[PDB]
Amino acid sequence: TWLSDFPQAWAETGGMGLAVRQAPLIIPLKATSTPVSIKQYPMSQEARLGIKPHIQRLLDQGILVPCQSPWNTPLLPVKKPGTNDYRPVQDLREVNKRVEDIHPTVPNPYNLLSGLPPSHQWYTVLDLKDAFFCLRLHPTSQPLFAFEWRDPEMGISGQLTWTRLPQGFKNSPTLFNEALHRDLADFRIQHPDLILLQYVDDLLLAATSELDCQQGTRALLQTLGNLGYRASAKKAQICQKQVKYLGYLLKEGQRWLTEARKETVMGQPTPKTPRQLREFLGKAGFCRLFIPGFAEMAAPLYPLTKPGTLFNWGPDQQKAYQEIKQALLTAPALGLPDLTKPFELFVDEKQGYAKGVLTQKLGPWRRPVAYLSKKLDPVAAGWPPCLRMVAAIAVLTKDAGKLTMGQPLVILAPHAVEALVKQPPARMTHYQALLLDTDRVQFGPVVALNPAT
Amino acid sequence: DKKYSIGLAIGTNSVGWAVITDEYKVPSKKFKVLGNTDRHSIKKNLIGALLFDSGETAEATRLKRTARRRYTRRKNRICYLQEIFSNEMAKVDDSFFHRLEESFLVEEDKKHERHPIFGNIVDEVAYHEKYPTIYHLRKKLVDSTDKADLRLIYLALAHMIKFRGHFLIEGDLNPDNSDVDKLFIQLVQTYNQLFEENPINASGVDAKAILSARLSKSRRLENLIAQLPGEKKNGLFGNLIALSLGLTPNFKSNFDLAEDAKLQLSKDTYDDDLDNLLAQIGDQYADLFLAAKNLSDAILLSDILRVNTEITKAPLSASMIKRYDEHHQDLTLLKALVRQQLPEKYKEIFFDQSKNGYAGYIDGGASQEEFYKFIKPILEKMDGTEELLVKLNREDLLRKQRTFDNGSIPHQIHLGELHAILRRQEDFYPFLKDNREKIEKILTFRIPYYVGPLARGNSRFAWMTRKSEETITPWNFEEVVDKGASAQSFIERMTNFDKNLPNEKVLPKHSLLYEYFTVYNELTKVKYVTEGMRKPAFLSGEQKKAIVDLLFKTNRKVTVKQLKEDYFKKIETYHDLLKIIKDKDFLDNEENEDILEDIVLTLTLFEDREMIEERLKTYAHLFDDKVMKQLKRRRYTGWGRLSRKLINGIRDKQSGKTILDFLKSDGFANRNFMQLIHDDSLTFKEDIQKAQVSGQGDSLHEHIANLAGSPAIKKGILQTVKVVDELVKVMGRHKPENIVIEMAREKNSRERMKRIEEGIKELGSQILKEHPVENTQLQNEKLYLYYLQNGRDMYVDQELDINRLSDYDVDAIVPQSFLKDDSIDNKVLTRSDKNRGKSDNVPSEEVVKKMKNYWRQLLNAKLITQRKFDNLTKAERGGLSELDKAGFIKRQLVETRQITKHVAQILDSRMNTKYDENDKLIREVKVITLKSKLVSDFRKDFQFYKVREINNYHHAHDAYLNAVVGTALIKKYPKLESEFVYGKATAKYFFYSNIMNFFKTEITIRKRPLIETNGETGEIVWDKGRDFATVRKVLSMPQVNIVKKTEVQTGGFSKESILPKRNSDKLIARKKDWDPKKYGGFDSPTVAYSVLVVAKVEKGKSKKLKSVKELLGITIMERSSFEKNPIDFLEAKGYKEVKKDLIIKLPKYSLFELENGRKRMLASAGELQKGNELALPSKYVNFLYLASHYEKLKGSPEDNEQKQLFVEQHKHYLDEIIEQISEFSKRVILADANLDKVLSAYNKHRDKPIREQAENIIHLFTLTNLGAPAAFKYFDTTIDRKRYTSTKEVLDATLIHQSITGLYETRIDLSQL
DNA sequence: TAGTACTCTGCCATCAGAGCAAGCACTACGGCCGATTG
DNA sequence: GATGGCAGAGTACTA
RNA sequence: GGCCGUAGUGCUUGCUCUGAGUUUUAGAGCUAGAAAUAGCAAGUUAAAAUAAGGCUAGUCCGUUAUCAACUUGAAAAAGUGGCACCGAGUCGGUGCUCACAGCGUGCUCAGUCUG
DNA sequence: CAATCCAGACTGAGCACGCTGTGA
């Protein structure tokens, strides 16, 4: 029923999008710059047919118009991680080095989910289709982007410039972020209760009750409809407690992990080459926030990653592999950090590997927010156990800052090394400033912690 | 962007190259192909070689130019004689000269009578009957006193003038002096009359045989001295005899003259030298000197004239007439004898022009040697032929007047005959009486060598200056040509400029300023030590002045004892002119230094006394007549290396003192010239730098041409520079880190024959007479050594046998380990090598003592050289010391050749151009030079064997290995950049012996680490685990860019042989009006380049236009005509409606791609060459090397055995190699008959040992080779060439234009045209 | 059936010499000379 | 000193 | 290492000359035969050309060096061609873009202290 | 007057490779 009410907002009915608020944008160039013409790189016959339907449909919408320009870059298809859609990519390698640089303002994936509070339990995830094509491109900068496409059936051979912001351009993610942010900035004012999270094109709406989400979703759809952006209706989780956003499951205000992601990590067999081990490590690393003490757990496999070495899968390596497989089976539910309340961090350090968990108050219990673990630098590796904990706290406190948004937090550790920092038995002065800042960090009652935590 | 290095191997006819990365891996990138073909890209490796034809020197061109000039001058001489005779010849027979000009003309082409002299048959026949040869007419004109026909007089004079004779002897010759014994007796009588106290007796001495012997002049003088009592060599009579026989004696000891006063009888200055000597001693020796001159004339003439001159004034003509008569008598006798004894061979002897004999001797091309060789057995197998055989043995049987031996006839004989004819016939001809002097001038005139060509501003070679602008005839040469200025320009155009002042000419070596500068430099380096001195002290300026004035300005040689006594004890060119001018204040004066410089410059510049005296006339008022005469007598030779401006002109900016002034006023510092020019405070270095900046540098080709070396090497250098630039452009305009380069080190039989003949004549032996040896036989090394050693052993005193050759031991004087010299100057043939003593040093002291006299005799006979003698007698000097051994070992690895230094400097200047803030050039690219020894040792040690007969890939492989080895060496040993990168005895010996020992896993047993590290730095310079595998992979790649440099042929038009007349279209007219079909002409023209013409031709009676595509050979002669108007040139050839756009220029070695990768190279417009290289597997290459035993065996017995077992187990590789050759031939060579013959030979010779089979299989790669086909041999079977004599197939192939590296190509599909 | 047209095989290629001048490159001996820093 | 020209004998296609 | 002085060898460039060699013509071939042919006689020398030739018209020059293709050029000359990886029978195949984030490792530069 | 022609550890900044993830 959502599609019928807002014909101007859904991509399956509203057609092509066009930002009616942002003006056409001139793509600037460096002072010492000259046009460069690069011939279209060879493309396989299977990949050529992938893009061809897109060019035919891109021509009808007016995005691609024939032109004669001295700039020319080789078109290149990139198939989606799924199926063989073969999305069109311009391959602006040479133009990127020639185009000017602007300060990026895109949000990093670590900090978006930190803004989501556990109070807002109802979600509505909308993803905007053909996001980068919404912004119009000034005809002056249109000759900058071009490519050679000759099809005898079409009857047109030559360059086809883009009238909108192309894909594969280095400034596209930044320019699209600001453009969308200004349009929705007015929406945020009108609805103080709603929490709107924006990731390039993906939008997440968080509300308190079911009725609040329904009212907010209608306003958001109406707002985007006038602005011209079109949202895909095939994949749009609306008014559901269970939503998938940023690759994370969101249920009961907890940042779960998708069951499919766990299957991929364990599904791979025992690695036999450094390339095979590198593939497995990367999957595990994305889940490092869920696995407690992941730095020490995957310690044996790290020296095997080096390009110059012999891949000897010894019994110790198999023990490290089994630990990661079993840890991901029972990965806990990381809670959404609440910025209003203070944080709590447990720190522990055994055998030169720092481990800990960031927790927050949940009723009478503590709920984990993110598991933090690191490998101590070799300079701190040789330190005595009393001094090793001081270095371990500093490393983990740096990691906690990237998620707590700079809010004050309490560092709890078994030992009482908090007084040791004041009177230790260059770098030490750096550690003193980080750990003694009462505004950002403090030490609570000294107490041990459970090994699992 | 990637760090890379370039390796280059430079040969005389090949330049290999290879680009390597940090891991010694050759990159590979796709390259765009231009053209109309469907191929638009190609993948190639960055390794290859460029092959080009070897360059040539200008010697042949210079000889041809000299021949042209000589022919022009001879024709001009004949023209002068005709101009003199013209009026009277027009009065007598007006058409005589016209008939003479048109002698080379067929009957229908002559506009006058066919008979050239008289014009009628009766008179011509009578003349030829009366004078069968021109010498008969010449003798008749010389001897007869009656009137003679004017045409006959002109004919004799023209013959004499056209064929004058050599100008080797100066002065005048009197033919009347012919008897040797009579003149010797007269000389002895004069000597006895003068020297009464000690008379000389010469009775009973065969003076004629002794003086006229065929031995050397020195040997003849020695024999005459031995057979003459009362005097010996260096005596008065001995010196007179030496002067008579031609040697230059020193008469100083005879009269105690204290001056050399050497007299050479053949030299032009003999009269002046004799006058000076007579003024020195007296006038009573003039009779003796005149007798010696007459004896010399007789000695030189009697060997040539060999006739009685008491009855005729034309001894040469009389000798030729006697030769004619002897020829006639011998011919009659031979005819009679052959008819009597061997009638069946009479036809083949006196009628067949093909076979040698009389018919082939006269009518055919057989020479005197061939005639004698043919007719000697016939005369031997006959009776009554004893005197004919004697004449044959003495080379005086049936001799023509015009022969090769006539090159020893002086022009003075012809001059005397011409003078006699003119004297006889001047009474009847007043015009002959008047022009006698100018006719003699015509005969005897020759342009001086220093004058040069008589050009007028349109010749690059000429340098002569004319004082008057008019035609230079032989009669006004002195009055038109400025001889002194011409000679000065001749000398100055070749002398060097100063290197510190490139625009300043150098001073003469014996210049006064040069002498003063050198003496002062030598003086400033003598540190005197005497009593009362705390430390050694240097001479002050005033002390140096006093020493120079007291010692140097007084005595020629200043010694330390003289310095101590005449100055330290008594007180504490300049000398040559002092005895000449007899003036001390003039020489010590300082305002006449310009006069002195001009005097010494004149003496150095001019060698002729007349030129010296005419140049010195301006200074005649300063001196007296005798002083001027002495100055003319004195002459200096030599040019210095320092300019007058550098020595005394330039002054310091701070002090205003010249280099000479500082040298005079050095004082306590006593800094020499090098210190003065390298001082930073002094402005001399700055001024030197500024002077060298002016001019900067010329073009690359001009600089390479100005370099010194072989033209082939210079061409290789230019090609190397161009390929370096091409590779830099290919790699993205990024210069490489290092450029490792290397350069190879590199009729003779006639020269060996002349050298052995001269040595045998000097030594007095008769080894050649015992058993003559031909030049081809003398080309053998062992035979050459045996003959040079006079047939006797060199290390011990015994006699060797020629019939026992191939059994004696060849030994190197310097051991081969220390120095790798295989020349005859270092090779010695002896019965056993063990006679030399120890094998690790110079020959032993006992052997040196035994054979010192023999070696000295060989040196005096010019059989061995000074270097050979010094090497042989090094045991007495001390032998090869440890320092010498270490040096010799080091120099086998460190390159020291000046040509390599020049190449490195050129590459460094091209690569590194940027400068720092302090004007310090940044060494962005490090140019490394290595010798071939390092790479060859690497290949031998690590099984990377090289076989040159497989293909041309070895050039590229050598370049790659050079790059790898150089980069690894400079990584491991940064301290060696001084001796490798352009920019104690025991310790040095073992350092360079194990310099390359870091590559190998085991030493000597030392377990060297698997990974080689830099040391003191964390750089891995080598990894034996994988770097050897990388080298093996690179050497096994099948793609290597081999490019043959296309060139446009230049040179001679065709073969120089003039063929007789024949009805062939290939003959080329010698003149525009000479029909080849009636006069003969040249053939075999050389094609400059082929031209692809697509046109229509007239075919059949109807002359229908048929479209034709073909190749036309544009020869060298018609290249200019074609380039001036190709349309008209092609239309004249018969082609109509040609296309200028479709005309394609195709030089030699043009590459065509036909099918299955078959490549043909354009040898000419009607021939093709192979253009494909077989890439044999490296396993087969190594097996072939080991089985063939390249360079015999040079491994340890433990290592030698395992290689033989390896070959034994890999016996079956021979069949696989044969299969590879056969399949490559089937795909490319397409020589079915040759392949079948090769396979049959292989099948029939299968049972022979693996060694012989592999050695013969190496020859089989000649069939599958790139370039012109050549014949080879497999065991007994010889396989001829399969030449591709049709270029029709390439007209539908792909024409590939390859760059200098082959990475850039333009493929043109000729089938679309 | 004779006239061009193409292929294969063997033969054949100008050669000796004498002076003079200037220069470079290399080898081989003997005498002597280097300077700066620790 | 190879390597291209050249003549001559042999063989074959076409008017 | 450099400075020299002495000697030798090899090579390069330029100039002035010499002797041949080759080609056409001249040097009446005779006798017996229709003729091919056979038999005898004779032979040695000379003229001219010696790169065709050129204009600059000289008693000059003409065989050395240099030379892939295309565009701009009068010429001298200047420009023209993507990279990485896996392989190998004269080279073949595959791939290429972004922005942000996470983890492991290495390198360069600079500074600090100590010997 | 005689002989020869920097090591360690740490810290900071930048860069890069060698994998993954969120998206386009």
Strand D neighbours among B 1250-1309, CB < 7 A: 1267-1268, 1270-1271, 1281, 1285
SS3 content of chain B, % helix, strand, coil (to 5): 45, 10, 40
What's the CA B1100/C1' C1 distance, rounded, in angstroms? 18
Cα–Cα dist A136/A24, whole Å:
5
Structure tokens at A287: 């889940």
Give a yes or no: residue A10 inside a domain.
no
Does residue A395 share a domain with residue A382? yes
Q: Residue closest to E16, CA→C1'?
A: B449
How far apart are alpha carbons A245 and A125 in whole angstroms? 7
Range of the domain at A247: 109-131+172-255
Among residues A237, A261, A248, A294, the alpha carbon closest in space to that of A112 is found at A248
What is the C-alpha to C-alpha distance for residues A324 and B1220, in angstroms, rounded to an integer? 57
Q: Within a 10 A sphere around the Cβ of B567, how many other Cβ atoms?
A: 18
State the Cα–Cα distance between residues B1254 and B1183, nearest whole angstrom: 9
| Closest C-alpha to A187, from A216, A230, A228 | A216
Angle, CA B714 vertex, CA B713 and CA B716 arms, to 5°: 65
Task: Tokens 């930190």: give the residue.
Answer: A114
Is residue A344 domain-shared with residue A427, that is, in the same domain? yes
Phi, psi torsion values for A3, nearest 5 degrees: -65, -40
Asked if residues B472 and B663 have their Cβ atoms less than 8 Å apart, the reply is no
Provide the 8-state DSSP code for B1227. I
Q: Name the nucleotide with the smallest C1'–CA separation from A265.
A: F20
**Residue B995 has which token pair?**
């310099």
Contacts of B1004 (CB under 8 A, 6+ apart): none
Residue B1130's contacts (CB-CB under 8 Å, 6 or more residues apart) are B1093, B1095, B1112, B1138
Q: How far is the CA of B1246 from the C1' of E92 (A)?
A: 39
Same domain as A73, residue A149: yes
Beta carbons of B383 and B405 less than 8 angstroms apart: no
Task: Return the H-helix or E-strand segment holding B1106.
Answer: strand B1104-1115
DSSP state of B830: E
C-alpha count within 13 angstroms, C-beta hemisphere, residue A114: 19
List the beta bridge partners of residue B1054. none
CA–CA separation, B976 and B984 (whole Å): 17
CB B1095 within 8 A of CB B1130: yes
Instruction: Determine if strand E comes within 7 Å of the CB of B894.
Output: no
Indicate whether A381 and A251 sit together in one domain.
Answer: no
The radius of gyration of chain A's CA atoms, rounded to the nearest angstrom, is: 26
d(CA B888, CA B895): 12
C-alpha span between B259 and B1234 (Å, rounded): 77
Helix axes B134-143, B315-341, angle to 10 degrees: 140
The dihedral over CA atoms of B680, B684, B686, B688, expressed in degrees to the nearest 10, equals -130
Picking from B489, B525, B483, the residue whose alpha carbon sits closest to that of residue B505 is: B489
Q: Measuring from the CA of residue B1084 to each C1', which nucleotide is nearest?
A: D5
Residue whose token pair is 């003259």: B257
How many Å from the CA of A38 to C1' of E73?
28
Neighbours of B105 (CB within 10 A): 17
Q: Which residue(s) pair with B1093 in the sheet?
A: B1110
Q: Are B1163 and B1250 in contact (CB under 8 A)?
A: no
CB atoms within 10 A of CB B700: 15
B453 three-state secondary structure? coil
CA–CA dist B320, B315 (Å, integer): 9
- Distance CA(B946)–CA(B1190), nearest Å, equals 9
Mode of pairing for the β-strands spanning B827-830 and B809-812: antiparallel
Please tell me whether any atom of strand D lies within 7 Å of the Cβ of B1083: yes
Q: Is B530 exposed, middle or buried (0-12, 13-18, 19+ CB in 10 A)?
A: exposed
Q: Which residue is nearest to nucleotide C6 (CA to C1')?
A: B1286
Dihedral sign, CA of A144, A145, A151, A156? Answer: negative
Using CA atoms, how far apart are residues B1094 and B1236, in angstroms rounded to an integer? 39
Chain B residues 367 to 406 whose Cβ lies within 7 Å of strand D are none
Between residue 98 and residue 117 of chain B, the positions with Cβ below 7 Å from nucleic chain E are 100-101, 103-107, 114-116
Is residue B633 a contact partner of residue B606, using CB atoms and an 8 Å limit?
A: no
Q: Which of B1111, B1252, B1108 is nearest to B1188 (CA)?
A: B1252
Q: Which residues pair with B927 in a beta bridge?
A: B739
> Which residue, among B63, B17, B11, has the nearest Cα to B1052 in the 3D structure?
B63
Q: Which residues contact A130 (CB under 8 A, 6 or more apart)?
A: A11, A16, A17, A230
In angstroms, rounded to a whole number, what is the distance separating the alpha carbons of residues B852 and A182?
108
Helix (H) or strand (E) holding B223: helix B217-226
Residues A62 and A151 in one domain: yes
Cα(B33)–Cα(A24) distance, rounded to whole angstroms?
43
DSSP B784-829: HHHHHTTTB-SSSS-B--GGGTTSSEEEESS-TTT----STTTEEE
Q: Which helix (H) or strand (E) holds B1243?
A: helix B1232-1244
Residue with tokens 């030979």, as numbered in its chain: B1241
Same domain, A121 and A215: yes
Closest Cα to residue B726, out of B184, B1301, B175?
A: B1301
Give the distance, in angstroms, between residue B729 CA and nucleotide E79 C1'.
Answer: 12
Bridge partner residues of A372 (DSSP): A356
d(CA B686, CA B1107): 73
Tokens 């020049």, residue located? B902
> Could you tell me the distance in Å between the CA of residue B1280 and the C1' of nucleotide C38?
77
Number of domains in chain A: 4
- Identify whether the C-beta of residue A14 lies closer than 8 Å to the C-beta of residue A8: yes
Distance CA B322, CA B317 (A): 9
Question: Nearest nt (C1') to B63 (CA)?
Answer: E63
Question: In sequence order, which ranges of B270-314 are alpha helices (DSSP H)?
Answer: 270-280, 286-302
Method: cryo-EM
Query: In whole angstroms, what is the distance from residue B1142 CA to residue B1091 CA?
Result: 10
Distance in angstroms, CA of B739 to C1' of F4?
31
∠ CA B102-B108-B114, rounded to 5°: 50
Q: How far is the CA of B814 from the C1' of C36 (A)?
A: 40
C-alpha count within 13 angstroms, C-beta hemisphere, residue A128: 30
CB B1062 within 8 A of CB B1049: no
| Measured CA distances, A352 to A88, A316, B592 (Å) | 48, 18, 96
CB of B353 within 8 A of CB of B374?
A: no
Phi, psi of A278 (to 5 degrees): -65, -35
The long-range contacts involving B170-174, CB below 8 angstroms and separated by at least 24 positions, are B170/B266, B170/B267, B170/B268, B170/B270, B171/B266, B171/B268, B171/B270, B171/B271, B172/B412, B173/B297, B173/B300, B173/B301, B173/B410, B173/B412, B173/B413, B173/B416, B174/B294, B174/B297
Contact A230, A128 (CB under 8 A): yes
Q: What is the number of other CB atoms lying within 10 angstroms of the CB of residue B339?
A: 11
**Nearest nucleotide (CA of A89 to C1'):** E97
Max CA separation in chain B (angstroms): 119
- Do A307 and A368 fall within a single domain? no
Closest CA to B1288 of B1035, B1090, B1098: B1090
Residue A414: inside a domain, yes or no? yes
Q: How far apart are CA A393 and CA A349, in angstroms?
A: 9
Phi, psi of A156 (to 5 degrees): -120, 125
- Spanning CA of B40 to C1' of E93, the rounded length in angstroms is 16
- Which residue type does A77 have? P
Say how far B458 CA is from E56 C1', in Å: 7
A229 and A298 fall within a common domain: no
Please give the helix or strand (H or E) that residue A160 lies within, else none: strand A156-162
Assess whether B1091 (CB) lies less than 7 A from strand E.
no
Q: Are residues A62 and A190 in the same domain?
A: no
**Which of A333, A332, A328 lies closest to A264, judged by CA?**
A328
CA–CA dist B349, B376 (Å, integer):
12
> For residue A2, is it within any domain?
no
CB atoms within 10 A of CB B1116: 18
Residues A250 and A265 in one domain: no
Q: How many CA atoms lie within 13 A of B662 on its CB side?
A: 27
Buried b (16+ CB within 10 A) or exposed e, B447-466: beebbbebeeeeeeebbbee
Of A236, A255, A274, the last residue of a domain is A255
| d(C-alpha A167, C-alpha A63), whole Å | 12
Q: Nearest 5°: CA angle at B606, between B600 and B607?
A: 115
Nucleotides of F under 7 A from a protein CB: 6-7, 9-12, 17-24
Beta carbons within 10 angstroms of residue B354's beta carbon: 11
Question: In this structure, are strands B1294-1298 and B1305-1309 parallel, antiparallel, or unpaired?
Answer: antiparallel
Using the structure, give the distance in angstroms from the CA atom of B1015 to the C1' atom of F9, rounded to a whole number.
Answer: 21
- Between CA B323 and CA B315 the distance in angstroms is 12
Instruction: Please tell me the distance from the alpha carbon of residue B317 to that of residue B142, in angstroms, as a whole number.
Output: 9
Q: Where are the beta strands (DSSP E) in B1117-1234?
A: 1144-1146, 1151-1153, 1159-1162, 1168-1170
Instruction: Report the C-alpha gap between B828 and B816 in whole angstroms.
Output: 12
Question: What are the start-end ranges of the H helices in B898-984?
Answer: 898-911, 932-941, 953-972
Q: What is the resolution of this structure in A?
A: 2.9
Please check whether strand E approaches the CB of A90 to within 7 Å: yes
**Closest C-alpha to B8, from B48, B35, B38, B43:** B48
Q: In whole angstroms, how far apart are CA A271 and each of A288, A306, B968, B969? A: 19, 14, 37, 41
CATH number at residue A407: 3.10.20.370
Q: Which residue is nearest to nucleotide C15 (CA to C1')?
A: B404
Q: Which DSSP letter does residue A277 get?
A: H
Residues A64 and A156 in one domain: yes
Say if residue A94 is in the same domain as residue A126. no
Chain E footprint bases within 7 A of protein beta carbons: 2-5, 7-9, 11-28, 41-54, 56-69, 77, 81-105, 107-108
> What distances in angstroms separate CA A291 from CA A330, B888, B1013, one per listed residue?
9, 72, 43
Q: Tell me the sheet residues that pair with A137.
A: A25
DSSP letter string, A288-305 = TTTSTTHHHHTTTTTGGG
A268 within a domain of the structure (yes/no): yes
Task: Give B1161 CA → E71 C1' in Å.
Answer: 28
Q: Find the CATH number of the domain harbouring A72.
A: 3.10.10.10
**Residue A355 corresponds to which tokens in the numbers above?**
């481990």
- Token pair 């479209």: residue: B1107
* CA→C1' distance for B455 and E56 (Å): 11
Q: How far is the CA of A261 from the C1' of F20 (A)?
A: 12
Structure tokens at B354: 């093909």
Cβ neighbourhood burial of B226 (10 Å; 0-12, 13-18, 19+): exposed
What CATH number is given to the structural domain containing A225? 3.30.70.270
Instruction: For residue A8, tell me if it sits in a domain.
Output: no
In a domain, A5, yes or no: no
What sign results for the dihedral spanned by CA atoms B505, B510, B515, B521?
A: positive
